[PDB]
Symmetry: D2
């Protein structure tokens, strides 16, 4: 596509997109075009508005485009073209990516006892309500545990909420503790969001006992 | 995929899918699995049910799966595996395709006068509310008009309703009437549904006058 | 989207799209934009060309866009904007839909004997190499057989070729012949293409014997 | 979906997926099923193989599934079900995610001079050949620069190679340097892969002069 301003918009929240170059108040020669999950290719929106699109995205007095409550289908591209009172045309180009933050992740079915030298189920980490899916990962004593290295194995599951579309992730950790190791290790699980710069979320630790 | 029974399900209507081989009433060893626009790959549904899926698809006393109001995202594959009281396992495999019937098509901006030997805009046909999109076509004196043959031009547009997903189609017809032709031709437009065996819908005719 | 000329382009064949309004030969102020399965949103192509796109779509001396061999990923929208020597701007807007014609359909595993009053497997119809998928249907004595009416049942299967993407369809017909019926019925199967105005293809008939 | 082992497979490289529980050499009662970008829902692959799938994915003597050169369309789910010589059934479930590493990122059009207190174009960072797309970000003196905080502006562009599908990313940085700031700041750009635990790639720094 073209160069654009990246916009990250949280599901359910309003979004206001600026029409660069527009007169501050009507009358305004401006047009918005958007290609999102709602549209077949580009849809043009005008200041007068009208129709079912009024429920979804409407042009404000100052020419900005307003969505009262962003949803997954609003992901896409939003563009404005305006003329000011002199006649200079100005373009605005936005790439809108939608997200939701899940609840704090939780560990379920955690083991209280591990045996060294054999594979053990440590626990299952669960995260509910993310978009995009994101990923879960495990840590041992503040260091990331890497699947398929050093007796670590992980299995993963992804489900979607049937009405909201939001993701639930599950991650099952097994480890083979090394003989003569730490007898009270500390494990935890973290959720890493899909979009850049969004913060990770972490579970409470679990501290099994390891038997030599 | 595998062999399946094709099911066509109208948007907004209920759908009941039979679990072949299931005992007529509980207790029943049966499981439904579905992969639709709602799911990440396969989702398993059990007779006890539970959770958010209860709002969408639930197993009936006789083991059938019930959706109170089908939507676009229920398109996909629905399977049942049952054991009867003896131990015979029986599979059910359904490919569910969703549709909606648009309103009767309408011609707008129809021409009252055509000039022979030059291109004329005859009219614009509009169909609102279909799924899948379907197509519009034009007829002249009960015979199909073929675009880019014999001085016929057609342009087409597709839009989607922002909340329902249903399609609105527009088709603009231009013709160059042949000299010495019928002076009161009869044009009409038809909507052809996307799914097989669904009936076409037709507009009222228009009867312009052609000037030699 | 906007009004456009519909273009149907057969896979593997060349496609030439006209840039309306362009000067017949260089120099030409024209630009092509396309959004297809190959692109992230819109890609701009210029007369000078250059790069990997030269292998796929290149601007001709007369300003038309040339694709030497259309593929499934060329489905999408293709637009031109040209200025003539005076300064009139002219737009060209094309919606390109790709297709392939399968081989003639064939019936396999046809039954030689049917018993009246009980369900019988009549045969399996197979079509290989279509795009879009299209559909198969059955006929009895030159009339369409409707699944789930009058002792008819059909099961269907769709597969894709792993490298070409083209569809293979299979359709299994079972019928319960009515007692005292025609003792040498004639069945056949037809492939119906997905795009409008494309012709159906039909199998050779089969003529089982029916036993009262 | 179900619990699965996550597999990350580099485009163009071979992939071997183990059929857990299978006998070490024929005869083997095992079956692979896969749902990927190549398939319409599930495709079953058998030890005898055969057909066009032999070019893509074939079962080895030890029952593993072998793809000689993974492509984007092999993303998806791969399952095995085996019985050993005793009769024990064993399942294998793999979620295969494909990737490619881009070339080292490069800064182009870098500025030699910045003026403090006014917006300046610092440069454009480009990354070629990634899958999935991944993201670019900017750093100032070893700290991440956050768009739309403290006089920082970023615009982004994504394109796809028309034949390979791989992504090229561009990121244009503008900054308003703070008065009385460091007169020789150090900027750099980093590519962050889409999949977890894959390493970032970083550009050589640029060191413009800032004029008070
Ligand atoms: O679900 C729904 O129904 C729904 C959705 C969104 C929504 O919020 C809004 C979102 C955007 C904008 C607004 C104000 O728009 C207005 C109100 C009054 C005049 C105008 C308008 C102005 C001018 O602005 O003076 N110049 C114009 C020039 C040409 C044509 C129209 C205008 C715009 C309200 C409200 C309801
Ligand atoms: O911060 C920003 O907003 C921003 C960031 C980067 C940026 O680079 C670009 C420079 C030139 C072109 C482009 C893509 O084409 C664009 C972008 C925006 C509006 C339009 C546009 C055009 C028309 O042009 O025909 N008609 C329109 C009618 C209605 C609404 C929009 C348009 C086309 C992108 C432009 C703005
Ligand atoms: O507005 C909408 O679209 C919407 C409407 C309703 C809604 O909740 C439902 C969702 C799905 C299906 C249904 C009903 O089928 C149902 C639902 C629940 C139980 C039964 C049922 C009854 C009995 O009913 O006595 N005995 C049972 C015994 C065994 C198993 C089931 C039942 C039948 C209700 C969710 C959304
Ligand atoms: O009219 C019909 O319903 C019908 C039409 C054609 C037809 O051909 C087929 C024959 C065999 C297999 C298939 C696909 O696999 C299927 C089909 C249905 C259920 C299952 C299944 C299996 C499991 O098998 O492991 N576990 C399950 C657990 C829960 C729910 C379903 C299944 C697998 C299709 C079968 C039924
Ligand atoms: O796979 C591949 O590599 C491949 C793909 C497609 C292909 O066929 C073609 C497809 C389209 C066009 C052509 C001629 O283009 C040409 C040849 C010579 C000059 C120009 C050209 C002309 C002018 O035309 O005089 N004015 C121009 C004005 C500005 C910039 C360039 C030109 C165009 C060849 C050939 C190879
Ligand atoms: O037969 C036909 O070709 C045809 C059929 C219907 C038809 O209706 C339309 C009327 C107006 C607008 C539209 C969509 O927008 C279009 C259509 C075509 C080119 C452009 C365009 C614009 C720009 O406009 O900024 N810049 C461009 C730069 C490069 C290449 C194309 C464009 C925009 C469609 C137009 C032509
Ligand atoms: O350019 C490409 O991407 C491309 C490359 C190669 C190609 O054909 C192949 C496709 C998939 C896999 C392979 C090999 O694994 C294979 C293939 C065939 C047989 C065997 C094999 C051998 C034995 O080999 O002795 N004994 C066997 C005994 C039992 C089962 C298999 C084998 C191993 C070859 C298709 C495309
Ligand atoms: O490390 C691993 O491999 C692994 C990780 C997690 C894991 O959890 C699961 C436990 C049970 C079920 C599942 C999903 O269903 C699966 C998984 C694998 C094969 C099958 C399967 C079935 C059939 O079952 O009818 N027929 C088949 C025929 C051919 C090929 C595969 C199957 C079904 C997942 C299983 C294995
Ligand atoms: Cl799910
Ligand atoms: Cl639309
Ligand atoms: Cl397939
Ligand atoms: Cl692109």
């Amino acid at each position: 596509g073209a160069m654009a301003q990246n916009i990250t918009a949280r599901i359910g929240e309003p979004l206001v997109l600026k029409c660069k170059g527009a007169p501050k108040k009507p009358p305004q020669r401006l047009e918005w075009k958007l290609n999102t999950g709602r549209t077949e290719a580009w849809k043009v929106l005008s200041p007068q508005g009208g129709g079912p699109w009024d429920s979804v995205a409407r042009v404000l007095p100052n020419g900005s485009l307003f969505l009262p409550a962003v949803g997954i289908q609003d992901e896409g591209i939003f563009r404005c073209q305006a003329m000011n009172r002199n006649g200079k045309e100005t373009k605005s180009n936005y790439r809108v990516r939608v997200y939701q933050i899940p609840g704090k992740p939780e560990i379920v079915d955690s083991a209280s006892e591990l045996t060294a030298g054999v594979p053990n189920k440590v626990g299952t980490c669960v995260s509910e309500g993310s978009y995009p899916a994101g990923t879960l990962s495990w840590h041992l004593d503040g260091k990331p545990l890497v699947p398929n290295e050093k007796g670590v194995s992980v299995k993963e599951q992804t489900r979607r909420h049937p009405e909201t579309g939001l993701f639930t992730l599950q991650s099952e950790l097994m480890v083979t503790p090394a003989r003569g190791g730490d007898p009270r290790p500390t494990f935890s699980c973290s959720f890493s969001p899909g979009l850049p710069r969004h913060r990770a979320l972490r579970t409470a630790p679990i501290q099994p006992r390891v038997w030599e």
